[model samples]
Structures are given as structure tokens and as C-alpha cells.
Target: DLRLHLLLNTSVTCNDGSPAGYYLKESRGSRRWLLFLEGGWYCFNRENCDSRYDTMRRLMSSRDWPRTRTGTGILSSQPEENPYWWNANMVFIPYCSSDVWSGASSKSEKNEYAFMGALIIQEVVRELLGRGLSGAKVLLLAGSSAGGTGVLLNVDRVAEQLEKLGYPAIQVRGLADSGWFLDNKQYRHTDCVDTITCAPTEAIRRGIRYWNGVVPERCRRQFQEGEEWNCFFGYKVYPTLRSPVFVVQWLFDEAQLTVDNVHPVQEGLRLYIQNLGRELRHTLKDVPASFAPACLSHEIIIRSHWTDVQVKGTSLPRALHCWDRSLHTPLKGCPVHLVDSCPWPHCNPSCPT
Candidate 1:
């Protein structure tokens, strides 16, 4: 049997709210799992709460039927907020949040804070697992955009934590519709910059602008500097990431505003790897490829600039926010597929295969 835990986004009164909490929903399956959903910035804002909740509920409820409860609702009734409500099975965590770019915070602070929240959520999962709940099995983490970036940036941290706790670091899976973790410089247009005409004139665009404009200058510099070194530096660091990462890019996502721009940066990253000398390539080529097998890892699905869809009869922007298959098929790019399940010994391309 499976159980559903609904975590309703609550406003943070001075950044103080519940820590590592969850709600339980009983399911009809015998497998127990955990799903971690990453929320973008402004996720805690009262205004955007309904939409975020609705989207997540739709995704969760799309597959099966079961009991659902929110953090507040569960906490009010149970003495212990953390409850394991599933049988031993797979846990899938979906990263859903308001536009981290839309909040009153800067991109730098927003990014950092979002990462911290993700870490906290993972900790909550660990705590929940520690409760000795029956039938709990695989743990999965998934998200989109800012949520995707959170996993990318924190995968190692999560794995390390899980390892330290003696649990086989759960499989980490990511579906980034448009990742924002790479250096902002890679993308010529950001929500902050008005030069990019591709973006739609909506709350998402405005939110990006607000984040870029309000983010502290120092924070921006730090993010830029970090991006330059980590992504563009002569030495590679991210390929060292052992978790399975699935990236979904779009050739024409006016909403993402900066996704297509990743091509050049990805190219530069590969070139830097090549420059690591022949020995590294030989060793790393055997590393699990980062992209998925069907070349779906770097899939690029093409779609018109603006299209709308009905979710439960509510018209939503088809191009703006939907996770349509048409907009997310992989496109030809670097040797990303060769890097997905890379083992450590074969991590470096220069090392012996």
C-alpha cells in the first residue's frame, strides 16, 4: 500500500516555521517510498500557495487514489509530525515551487536559500526514515527549473548525508525542464535583463526581473564567480557527481528566458574537459553518462511560443508552464549520454578505461 504526504506551503513569519515535517496519506500498495518536491522561490508566499498546491496535487493524484493530508493538518492531530504511511517501495519527490525568481529576494540569495530549503527537506526525509517505518524502500528526489538546480547543487550533499546514516544513498533522479544552476553568464538573457524578447509578459517574467534587480550586488558577484570557476574553469567538478541526472532543455522556451543559452556554456564545459589531457578522457569516458539513454537526457521538445491547456478545466498556459512532451524531447549535443551511470574509477576521461 502507498501513503501520500502533502506538505502545504506556509508563509514564514520571520523564517520560523515547522522543520522537517510531513503529512501521511494511506495508499493501497505494499511499497513504501518518499517523494521530495522542490519548490521555487516565493513558494511560501500566501498569494501563490493555491496554484503551487494545485499543481502538485494534480501530479500526485494523476496516478492513483489514496488519503492525503497536509503538514498543518497532520501536525494538529498527531503528536509526532513525521509519519511513514507507505509500504516498502519507491519514494518519489517532486520539486514544485513558485518562481524563485519572482520573490522579493535577489537571484543569489534566492538561489542559496532555495538550496538550503532543499537540504532541510532531505533531512526531514532522513528523519522520517529513521522512525523505523515499515516497508520503506527506495527514495527518489525530483524537480524542475529552480527545483532541478537544487538537486544538482545538493546531490553530493544528500548522498553524503545518506551514506553517513548507513542508508544506501537513495537513487537521485532529476527532471529539469530548464535548469538555472549553471552560471548566469551562460544565459545572455535572465529575468533581470529586459533584452531577452523571448519571455512572456506574465508574473513569471516579472518575478525574474524582481529577483535579478533586488538580489544583492555582493550575492550576484559570488554567484557569477562561482559559476565561472565551477562551470567554466579548466578543471571539471560536476562530472564527479555520481547520481543520475536527467536534464530537459528547450530550443524555444520564452518562459525559461535562458535555457537555450545553455548550449554554448555546455560546449565550453566539454572543451574544458577535453583540455584535461588524453589520460583524463580515457578514465572518465567509462563514467556513467549524465544524459539519459534515449538521448532523452538532453531532449529538446519544440513548441509554439504561447499555447494554453486545460487542467481540470482551468485554462493554463500550454507553453508557459505545462510539462508537455512536445516541448521536452532531447536534442543533439555533447556526449552527455555517455556520462549517466559513470562509475568512479572511470570518472576521469584521462584515466584508464
Candidate 2:
């Protein structure tokens, strides 16, 4: 996008609840919009939160961010740069809220601890609507990693807001990349210590318990009592969406290796990722589309893989090219996957991301 628009900070705020805004490139008289939510890990507690201050959401200001950290795929200001969303208005929401913009979790004060990702998106959209999103033709809400979770968590609310803003005819959609983690505890009702299945783990428990109650009301309400945390799982929340959302997730996401003890090539890990990926798609069977490459990676938007990585034969940008064929074909959408089975995580020597 063009210049960082933190000047619009008056309209938006960072995790610290300070005025932090997005980078915007407006498309004159165009309704197509690409709204991106930046992603990063959450601060587990005070020490890390303090360590996080100079970085991410805790930073005193957007001015503290580096130049290369600024833009990503589809955030381009020029049409020729990102042929897929060139003319579309681009709003690059920064990842200052360590909570993946979930707008949940907080405590730090004064350019410090705060996690209100949900409010951040809401504020940005509110300002954008004032600037034209309300009357726009299409709006794509997207995010990777934590933002991916946030997007899934908040998609219905955005649709609801669009309707409330008097744009019932507006085309609203979602695209989540690497945000489709299973919310299930790694389950294993086994006596064998070498058993594979895992029940919900502490991480899952932590997310459900720690993440703010910003889970979509529709998703949360349907899950009986005390199952609200299930909403943190993209698969669990998929059925609750009144709108369709495209997904881009890796079957063996390498990022999981650090936190979840997932081994890249381990046979067992592959099986688990396969099951998770399988369950994810099955949960989303009614949804429009998904891109589940076998590669191990995360955060498609900020990475160079958009034009490089391929699942099956189609590269990501071109897959979206098919997604963008509103002119010649109906948007039946596509289900992206390997032709046969999910391969164990391995780095392609040629893989660029």
C-alpha cells in the first residue's frame, strides 16, 4: 500500500489501545476491497509481553516498524504489481495486537500489554466504511496465522456489520491462510505410551480460556455450554458462518513444530496433520474453496509463496485467478489439495518461501 496511515490512528487503535492505523491504498470508485490482517504469536504472560513491547503491538508507534515489514501480497498500490487485486482498495492492518487482532486478552497499559484484535479490525472497517467499504462491491477479509484465527472468529460479525451498514447486496467473503488449526485436544484413550492420537492439549485449553469471549455468537451459542473455546478452532467454527470463506493452510504447517512438537517428516506427525487437514476440509465441505498444500509453512500473505508454491499443479495466485473469474465463469470455487495424499513435510529444494 501507499503511506502508513497511522494518521488515521484517531480512528483505529493498536493492542495497547493507542491510536494505530492501517496502510491504505484506495481504488477510486471501486468497490473491490482486500482487507488483510497481519499475524504474529501472542504474549503468554508478563515477561514475554515485556519482551514484546519493542516489537509487534506493544511498540509505541507504527513509526517504529521497519520498511520491509510494511507490505505483502495484494497490498500493492499498483494494479500491475498484484494482478489479482490490483485495482481493489488495499488495507494492510498491522499486527500490533499480539492476539491476532482478536480484540481479546489484555492488561498492559501505556504502550504496553493489550490484545484487542477484534476492535482493531472493527475500527479499521468502521473507518473504511466511512471511506467507502459500505457501498463497495466486494470485500475480502483475510489473515494468516493468528489473524487467520481472528478472521474465522470474526467473519460472521463482519457480514453482519455489512448488512447493518445497509449493504445487503454487498459481496462479503473470507480467506484464511494457515489459520485452520484443530482445536481438538490431541486425543489418545490408549494404554500404550507410543500411541498416536491426542486429545485437546493445554494450548487448546489456553486459547479457549484465554482468548477473549469474542468468539462469534452464532458459533459459540450452538456449542451447548462451556464449549465456547471450540470456536477457536477454524473447523469447529466453519459451519456457523452464514457466509463462505476460502482457506489457505498447509497440511504440515512448520510453525506448529515449535509449539506443538510436530516433527516435519515423522510418520506420526504426518498422519496427525493429515487427519486434521482431512477433518478441516470435511468440516468445510459446504464452503466454497481451500488451498491445502502439503508443504510446511505458514502466513501466505506476507510470504513470497503466493506466486511460487503450488498445491497439486496450480500456484496460489493463479488459483485465485480462477477464484477471480467472475467475468467468464460462475464462482463455483475450487478445493485445493494434493492429487493423492498429503506428503510428509519436506522442503522443496526449489521452494522459495
Candidate 3:
């Protein structure tokens, strides 16, 4: 029943220059930490940014952030809801920079917004270090939707940052829920119009410049300067990650469908849905710890019924628990690489209807 206390830091401001902050619920004697990032799709251009400000201003600025927040799903304080990680030091970071947690740009005449998503993460970790995070045994950088993408993009950077801060012994891992976005061809064709309609490649390429987004050094080295946007994809960035990560990507991601212009209401897109799930399965094969359920959902980790969702007869929380143990004693615990065998969407009975 603990409420997450809001803690704002003036050192890291959002897009509108208001101070950035996080909601925290600390356990009495647990060395484990779980930092969950809130996700809202980003704006790739000035016009999109202006539109975002007008509509989803909360995601772009912390000017009116709630004084306190509640945690649910993996962040739930109740043991029955979260199971394994219920008692960990919980941190919930709201998305305000509208950069998918990759931007490092400051407000300028041309840009007209502060895109400091990545900086906010670094500052928050450093701030937490002074407040018991330094003594933590494990730090799980987890998120859903765009925040899930943030985890994939920043997990290694976080691990390296902690190492550089003299906490090399701290085990840093990632839990990216429903953020493994594909850069494949869209189901429908359209000229790039706005952030929502633009193809992933074009949108990311343009947004990287505007946001001054940073990618993993190893992945960045594999691509030329202009092609850094490739690193935004989970498949592209996963291979280069040094720290262990557990990817929780739904087979038929709804957010991805929106970007791809695939309408679920349409009758003739079953082939596209099947292909999307197949591609997702193919991409997830090499991941040692992942949970890919055949569902047409977006984010999962923060959902109240997260514990009910499963893959291959194993619930997500169970897979994560197994993965957590396997991280230390590889020979003792079983590897959790659960992926639904069904090639179609909504095939899993455990999936929410």
C-alpha cells in the first residue's frame, strides 16, 4: 500500500524546462532496485513537437507532475501482484522529454525544445546512488512501450555509468517490455507525413538529429554516422549489448501497427499479422532470456494483470524470476527463453482478450 513519493531534480529538466523527476518507493532492507520508465510515443519534427505539446503536454514537460504516484504490475508493492520483485526499491520515471529517452539536445531557436531524455536518466541514477542505490546488488532498468525502447538503448550505458561511478560490482540488467520495434516495411504504404505516419527509418533518422540522440558505442561503430538510427531497433542493438537483458515483446504489438499503418479493424491483414509475429519470433531466437507471447498488445509490465500473461505455459513473472537466478548461478537455474509457438496473433489463451 506504499505510495511512490515524487522527487524532482532541478539538474535535469524536461522539454519545457521544468525540472524532471521520478516517483520512488523504497523497501526497508532490500538491495534490489527496479527503475521503470513511462512510455509515450515521440515527436520527430518541430510540427510534431508542437502538436505533442498541445495534446500530450504531460509527456513533454513536468510542469504539472503529480505530487505522488502509485505503482502497479512489476512495480506493485503487494507481493501477490508483483511476486518476485515486490519488495525492491521501486522507481518510476515519467517521460517528459519526448525523445524515447535518447535525446541530449537543449532548447534552441530552431529546435525550440529541450530534449534531455538521456541526461535525465543519468542524473537520476547518480541521484539514486547517494540514496542507497550505491549499495544495491542488482539494478533492473525496466520499461514498457517507448520506455521499453529506452531500456534497450540505455541499458549498457547505465551499466557502464555505474561502473565508472565506482560501483562495478553492481549487476545491471534490462527488462524491456513491448519495445522491440521492427524497422521492416509497413503493411501499408504512405508518404512520410508526421511522426506517427512516417516510416521508422525516416522518423528515427530525423529525430536523432533534432534530439541529439545517443546510441550504444559498439552498435554505433558498426554503422556510419548518418546510419546511427539503425541502432534504435532492438534487433540491431541487442547483439552489441554487454549487459544481460530480458526482452518482453508482444508478438503483435499494437503500437507498431499504428506506425506501420496496419488497422486491426481491417479484414484482410491476417497475413501481415502472421508475418509480423513470425519475424518477431525469428528476431528473438538468440535472446537467452525473453518472453514473447502471441498477443496484439503493446506494453505489459505495468499492466495490473501482468502476472496473468504467459508464454509457453510460463508466466512472465516466473520467467523473469528464473532469468534473475540464472544470471548468477547459470548451472543452477533454468534459462527462461519462452516464446509462443503459435504463429498467429491472439493464439495464447492466457493473453488478455
Candidate 4:
């Protein structure tokens, strides 16, 4: 068993001006790494951020971070628990910037707090170079929820950064979980007020302005100067990403439903749920490696029973293993585009109860 220690770095501070850090579980002589970014929801404007700081202070500041943390799900050290990544050096990055890990601005006149999430990831990678990442053979940049969105936005950037830093041999890939959010019409038209009420695009558009969010250069150049927020949507940005990213998203994601104002229990929305799955399946068809189960869940990669869920008879862990082999080894791994064809939720027997 491995114990993860909270390694504080003063170079990176949270939105509330407190030091931010990551939890690390190092495996000796391992050239493999898995840097997972923890996710919480975001705030678009000052009013939302202020309220967030008051109600969910832990996400905005490291004022009360624990001294030690234990890794679960993919971060687990137990071979029986996490088959593919148990022996790799694991790093758990905490989300504190409240900017979906894309912000670059510090506290300023217009804004009351810093939004340095994008800066933090860069700093962490640079710091890890001295801690043996310089010799890393493969690095899996993974995240769930907002953190997963960060992977889509930052994976290519990280790879390019490593190449520039003279680690061109290092293979960088992405594993995004439950973050392939679509810019679809909500069930009801609601104005931007809070996290739940705000439409995805409107929230992100405002957050981009307030946070000075950074988008990947390739994707940014596709949109106009002021429309960099388009990169926040996974489908919009995925096509432009250079790094190979394996997506893990629920067909009927609960978070998407929350923001879309669709309640599955309300019988009338059954078709809406089916259409959501259809849309997701359509978008995912182009991805090289994906596991989209027909479930009503949100994040899955970090769940204790992550290995249980499956699509097209292939489990998430199995798909990831196949993906890894396909990338590195001479022997070709099986294709892992495991999208569930079933339209209804809970149709998969493997879905957890």
C-alpha cells in the first residue's frame, strides 16, 4: 500500500490567496506517471465566485487541506483494485482556481481573487521534472468532471511544453472522464445566475472573461478572438487536440442533465434522455478510444467500482489497458471504441445499482 502526502508548493496559490498543492504517491524507478486533476464545479462571475468561496471554501482555497491523502479508483496502489496503473507514480492535483483549470489571471482590480488554474498545471509539471518526470516514458494526464474538461483543454499544451523542455521522447496522453459536455439546448431557457441555472456556454463565456482563461493554441486559432470559450466544450476542442485522449463519459451524464434542467424521473423527458444518448454517441464515433456506457452517472474513472461498468462488453479499465498497449507496444491492442448502442439508461447490466 502507498501513502500519499500533500506536497505544498508556495509557487502556486489558490483563488483566495492561499498556497495550493498536490497529493503524491511515488513509485520508485517507475517511468510511468498518472497526474489526475480533482474536479469541483465552477463559478462564472464575481457573485457566483463570492458565494462559492463562502459556501464551498475548500475548492477555492487550501486553508483546510489534509496533511495526508489516500488514493482511490485509478490512483489506487492495490493491484486487485487498479490493474493498469497501480505501480505508476500517482499525483492527485486539487482544483482550487474555480476556473475549470483554464484561467491565467491573478487577483486584480476587476476581479477580487486570483484565477491561476492553467498556470498551476504548468508549474506542477515543471516541478515534477526534477522529481523524475524528466525521464518519464509515458504520462497519462487524467481528470474527472471539470478536471476532465481540463485534460481536453490542456493535454496537448502539456505535451508541447514537455517537448520544448527537452523531454520530447516522453509520451503524453489524456484520459478524460465525464467531461465531454455538449453545447446543446437546455430543457428550459434559463439566465446565468448560479452554477445550476447557468447554461453551459453562457457560464463558460463569462468565466472566460472573468478568469482570462487560456485555450489550446490550435483550437483558439479556429475561433474568433473573443470566442476562445468554444474550446471549453469537449466536442469543439477534441478534434484539434494532438495528443491521443481516451474519453470516458456517461451517455446520459447526470451533470449535463443538471445544467440542462432535464429530470430523468419526470416521464416526459424520456425521449430527451434518449436524444441525449444519441447525440453523445454521434459525437463519440470519431474518437479513437472511448467508453461511453448508457448510464445516468457523472464521473466514473475515480469511482471505487470503476472497473465494473462496461460498454460493448469492454470495461473501462480494459479499454484503458488496450489503449496503453496500442500506444506503446509492438503488438497491436484491440480497438477500444466501446460506446453503448442501447438508448435507455441502466440498460447495461454492468451499471452499478
lDDT of 4 by residue, 163-234 (tens): 898899999999999889989877778676667667888878888988889999989899979899899888
What is the lDDT of every predicted structure here? Answer: 0.34, 0.63, 0.86, 0.85
Better of 1 and 4 by TM-score: 4
lDDT of 3: 0.86
The C-alpha TM-scores of every prediction are 0.40, 0.79, 0.95, 0.94
Clash count, one per candidate: 57, 17, 0, 0
Q: After superposition, how far is residue 325 of candidate 2 from its true place, in Å?
A: 3.9
- Candidate 2 — which residues are off by over 4 angstroms? 7-12, 54-70, 77-81, 104-112, 184-211, 263-287, 326-342, 346-353
Structure candidate 4, residue pairs in collision: none
Candidates 2 and 4 compared by TM-score, better number: 4
Model 3: per-residue lDDT, tens digit, 262-346?
Answer: 7733456877777888898999998988998888888888888888987766798888889877876454435499888797777
- Please write out the lDDT profile of model 2 over residues 190-246, one tens digit for every residue: 322221222334434443445454678887688756766677777778888876677
Give the distance in Å from residue 299's predicted Cα in candidate 4 to where it truly belongs.
Answer: 0.6
The better-scoring model by TM-score among 2 and 3 is 3
